[PDB]
Design a protein around this ligand. Structure first.
Ligand SMILES: NC(=O)c1ccc[n+]([C@@H]2O[C@H](COP(=O)([O-])OP(=O)(O)OC[C@H]3O[C@@H](n4cnc5c(N)ncnc54)[C@H](OP(=O)(O)O)[C@@H]3O)[C@@H](O)[C@H]2O)c1
Ligand SMILES: Nc1nc(N)c(OCCCOc2ccccc2CCC(=O)O)c(-c2cccc(C(F)(F)F)c2)n1
Ligand SMILES: [Br-]
Length: 163
């Protein structure tokens, strides 16, 4: 099973200025809970975005997709395409594609599940933003309730599966 997992603003923004343009501890916890013990596949720019205490992501097999064959990525496995990332020598029962926008677009046709956090925050898109994929009629989903973060932001989780 190949799943995508992302958090987006209402407007679809997932990334800005090399990071994520809001804070939501409850979503970071959700991400850690769903991915721990599994393979996490990410694009090189997402690898570059991980803070030092979170690089590599602990307790997960980190796989980084790049065209730069000689990339130095200590703690991760470097691969040259998304297809390579999804064709491990050691299979994993659960593989999660964890971003960013470029890799989500490539992974969506190969995936059967998306776990999406919607964040109740108004962020008009800016020119260099990374944006979430859009789920068409081949996907169907179920929504959790609106939840209130300690910080004040509200958020809700959606679980989509391929029809
Ligand atoms: N909110 C969320 O849930 C979430 C999750 C993850 C990331 N983010 C944010 O998203 C942003 C990063 O996303 P992004 O779209 O800019 O980058 P990205 O998808 O993480 O990485 C793009 C890189 O992947 C590699 N790549 C792309 N297509 C490839 C292909 N066909 N074959 C081989 N390598 C390929 C290239 O690496 P090379 O240039 O090295 O060749 C490319 O520069 C950051 O702001 C990050 O904080 C948000
Ligand atoms: N639902 C979902 N899916 C994602 N693919 C996702 O990004 C995963 C790659 C980025 O990871 C990190 C970035 C900065 C610090 C720590 C981590 C992971 C540390 C770990 O997991 O040990 C996120 C995510 C991650 C961090 C913060 C937010 C925010 F700001 F929205 F709250 C969202 N959330
Ligand atoms: Br956070």
């Amino acid at each position: 099973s190949v799943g995508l997992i992302w958090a987006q603003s209402t407007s679809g923004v997932i990334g800005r200025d090399g990071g994520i343009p809001w804070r939501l501890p409850e979503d970071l916890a959700h991400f850690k809970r769903l991915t721990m013990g599994h393979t996490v596949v990410m694009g090189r720019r997402t690898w570059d975005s991980l803070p030092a205490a979170h690089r590599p992501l602990p307790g997960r097999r980190n796989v980084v997709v790049t065209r730069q064959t000689g990339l130095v990525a200590h703690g991760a496995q470097v691969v040259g395409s998304l297809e390579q990332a999804l064709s491990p020598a050691e299979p994993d029962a659960a593989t999660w594609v964890i971003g960013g926008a470029q890799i989500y677009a490539l992974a969506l046709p190969l995936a059967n599940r998306c776990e999406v956090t919607e964040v109740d925050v108004d962020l008009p898109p800016e020119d260099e933003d990374a944006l979430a994929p859009v789920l068409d009629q081949t996907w169907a989903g179920t929504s959790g309730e609106w939840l209130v973060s300690r910080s004040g932001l509200r958020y809700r989780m959606h679980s989509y599966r391929r029809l």
